[PDB]
Amino acid sequence: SGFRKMAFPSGKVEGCMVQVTCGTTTLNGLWLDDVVYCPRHVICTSEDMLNPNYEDLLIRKSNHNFLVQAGNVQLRVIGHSMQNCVLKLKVDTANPKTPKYKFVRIQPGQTFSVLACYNGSPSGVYQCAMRPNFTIKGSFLNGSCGSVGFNIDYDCVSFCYMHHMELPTGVHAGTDLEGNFYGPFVDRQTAQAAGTDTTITVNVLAWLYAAVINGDRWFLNRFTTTLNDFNLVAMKYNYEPLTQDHVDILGPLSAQTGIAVLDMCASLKELLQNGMNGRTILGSALLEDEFTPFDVVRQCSGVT
Amino acid sequence: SGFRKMAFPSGKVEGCMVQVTCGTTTLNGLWLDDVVYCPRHVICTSEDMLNPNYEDLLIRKSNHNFLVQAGNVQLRVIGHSMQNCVLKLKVDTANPKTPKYKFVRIQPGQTFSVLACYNGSPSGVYQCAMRPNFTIKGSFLNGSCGSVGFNIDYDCVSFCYMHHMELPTGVHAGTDLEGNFYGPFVDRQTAQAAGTDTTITVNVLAWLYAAVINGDRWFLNRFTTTLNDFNLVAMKYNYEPLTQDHVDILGPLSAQTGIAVLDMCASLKELLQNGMNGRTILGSALLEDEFTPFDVVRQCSGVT
Ligand SMILES: O=C(Nc1nncn1C1CC1)[C@@H]1CCOc2ccccc21
Numbered sequence: 001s002g003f004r005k006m007a008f009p010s011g012k013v014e015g016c017m018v019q020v021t022c023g024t025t026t027l028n029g030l031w032l033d034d035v036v037y038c039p040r041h042v043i044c045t046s047e048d049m050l051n052p053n054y055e056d057l058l059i060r061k062s063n064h065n066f067l068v069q070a071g072n073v074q075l076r077v078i079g080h081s082m083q084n085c086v087l088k089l090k091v092d093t094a095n096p097k098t099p100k101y102k103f104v105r106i107q108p109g110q111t112f113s114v115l116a117c118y119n120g121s122p123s124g125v126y127q128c129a130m131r132p133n134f135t136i137k138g139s140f141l142n143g144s145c146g147s148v149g150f151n152i153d154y155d156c157v158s159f160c161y162m163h164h165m166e167l168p169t170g171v172h173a174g175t176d177l178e179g180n181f182y183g184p185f186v187d188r189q190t191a192q193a194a195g196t197d198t199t200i201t202v203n204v205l206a207w208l209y210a211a212v213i214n215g216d217r218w219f220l221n222r223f224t225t226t227l228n229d230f231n232l233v234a235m236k237y238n239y240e241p242l243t244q245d246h247v248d249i250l251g252p253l254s255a256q257t258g259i260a261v262l263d264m265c266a267s268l269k270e271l272l273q274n275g276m277n278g279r280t281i282l283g284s285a286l287l288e289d290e291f292t293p294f295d296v297v298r299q300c301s302g303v304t
Numbered sequence: 305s306g307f308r309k310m311a312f313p314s315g316k317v318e319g320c321m322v323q324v325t326c327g328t329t330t331l332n333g334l335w336l337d338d339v340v341y342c343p344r345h346v347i348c349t350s351e352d353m354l355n356p357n358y359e360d361l362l363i364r365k366s367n368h369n370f371l372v373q374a375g376n377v378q379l380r381v382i383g384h385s386m387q388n389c390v391l392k393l394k395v396d397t398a399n400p401k402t403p404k405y406k407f408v409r410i411q412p413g414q415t416f417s418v419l420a421c422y423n424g425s426p427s428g429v430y431q432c433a434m435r436p437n438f439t440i441k442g443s444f445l446n447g448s449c450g451s452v453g454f455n456i457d458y459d460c461v462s463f464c465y466m467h468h469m470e471l472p473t474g475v476h477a478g479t480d481l482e483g484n485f486y487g488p489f490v491d492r493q494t495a496q497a498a499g500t501d502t503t504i505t506v507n508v509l510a511w512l513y514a515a516v517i518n519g520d521r522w523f524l525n526r527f528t529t530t531l532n533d534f535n536l537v538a539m540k541y542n543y544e545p546l547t548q549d550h551v552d553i554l555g556p557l558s559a560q561t562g563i564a565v566l567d568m569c570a571s572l573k574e575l576l577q578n579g580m581n582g583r584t585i586l587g588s589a590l591l592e593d594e595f596t597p598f599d600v601v602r603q604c605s606g607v608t
Pocket residue numbers: 041049140141142143144145164165166167172186187188189305
């Protein structure tokens with residue numbers, strides 16, 4: 001037993017990280033097959049970032065201007081193109097360590113692991129969630145751009161995020177592996193404020209089920225509620241509305257614990273209205289929302 | 305910016321995980337060079353666990369009784385020995401993926417990454433701290449024994465923990481890689497209760513410095529304190545006493561932020577006495593103690 005904020009094993013993704021340098025700018029690239037993917041802002045000077053015309057800035061770059069280093073060896077760039085906000089650098093060597101992979105665009109509320117990298121080298125791995133305002137709360141310093149977010153289904157890595165930037169509020173923004181930003185963010189040094197960071201209700205409920213499975217049961221009460229009544233309280237507390245689709249997704253956890261989804265909603269409603277009173281749930285003093293129902297089942301069943 | 309509970313990249317350790325089976329029992333082993341290390345309780349039936357005589361149970365086991373599988377290939381066991389609570393299985397093939405490594409015994413308060421495994425296969429990675437009562441609060445189900453804890457210094461993995469058991473309270477116990485348990489725990493299905501789980505003061509202070517570096521400054525106050533005054537409050541709150549050695553260790557973080565260590569102690573003293581008042585620090589509603597001062601510097605500087 002025990003329940004931790006767990007990231008996927010990062011080995012398969014470490015095998016893909018390379019360093020990409022264009023002029024004075026060094027960031028990370030993701031090498032899969034014979035393509036290296038990286039944020040297109042690698043072509044910018046800090047001055048260009050204020051109002052960059054990427055097509056125009058790219059005209060001044062040739063294949064030999066993109067320096068790609070995998071470990072201590074240089075890769076030969078034989079082609080380059082821009083797809084949305086990412087560059088795809090075609091190299092002459094397929095990555096021998098390329099795992100089975102997919103490029104997926106995730107929905108808000110979905111979690112993933114980030115392998116934070118600097119100069120093509122992994123520094124650490126942590127678990128993130130795509131927030132309902134399409135930001136992530138990561139740990140990214142200068143040089144971390146191009147680090148990726150992913151999930152793993154046994155031996156297939158599904159890449160869902162590439163890090164591009166930090167907003168003035170300290171929250172993070174990035175793209176899927178097709179270069180499309182999550183949310184309304186743009187790769188420009190301009191005023192960009194994030195919307196409301198609501199709490200991912202279905203994930204909190206999943207985590208309350210993990211707490212029950214792992215023996216923390218003090219918050220269970222004698223009440224029930226309805227989706228409509230629960231959502232009135234969820235609205236007041238800046239929680240995402242709970243839908244019948246979320247109820248269906250929590251079905252397996254409801255079955256495992258014998259606690260009906262709406263009874264768990266009533267427990268959550270009381271926790272919102274009354275607070276924790278100085279108590280903790282799975283070592284947390286706040287309601288955790290960065291575990292999906294699938295993450296809870298995965299961790300509680302020991303999937304590899 | 306941003307500060308996350310980050311684990312080390314796990315690739316180097318994934319390359320070492322194997323499955324070990326003895327009779328009906330399957331757990332994990334750590335394959336380094338031509339030796340596979342695993343918990344000695346792999347030789348026990350659930351019945352033997354109540355009062356096992358490991359030397360006697362081991363007499364009934366031969367090299368061919370230890371089935372070691374690395375991926376989908378079987379390893380040949382050419383020797384076996386017991387060192388404290390671990391078995392060392394000599395195999396005929398050195399692990400080709402053996403990283404540079406050390407075996408270290410850590411002190412309470414030190415953190416490490418755990419690569420949770422089942423049947424020699426990695427399921428996830430998370431960050432732990434050796435608690436002051438020599439337990440860890442992990443996420444370990446049946447089959448996870450033999451999963452290891454480690455730290456990495458660039459390319460050298462220092463293995464510090466091997467998982468052996470779960471106490472009736474749901475907390476975890478294990479050994480260093482020489483097979484010596486942390487704390488007073490024994491590998492026997494008997495009443496073993498953990499002592500007081502005090503809070504690792506030096507780690508909380510390090511995390512308050514990370515909060516200041518990452519822009520969360522509301523808790524900074526106009527006060528200072530002394531080590532003796534602070535420790536009177538630390539004692540009342542079940543916090544570890546702060547020593548001049550801890551003050552020295554926090555020196556670099558004090559320098560980076562310009563906040564004297566004793567002023568940060570005074571901020572912590574007020575947080576203990578007054579609570580958070582519904583506010584958060586780095587997204588937490590409790591004072592986090594599973595980041596060492598070295599972890600804070602490492603993460604805030606982007607070490608790879
Ligand atoms: O935010 C950036 N880098 C970054 N992403 N996460 C952390 N970091 C560094 C800690 C800042 C850079 C800085 C200059 O302005 C822009 C504009 C657009 C895209 C990227 C950037």
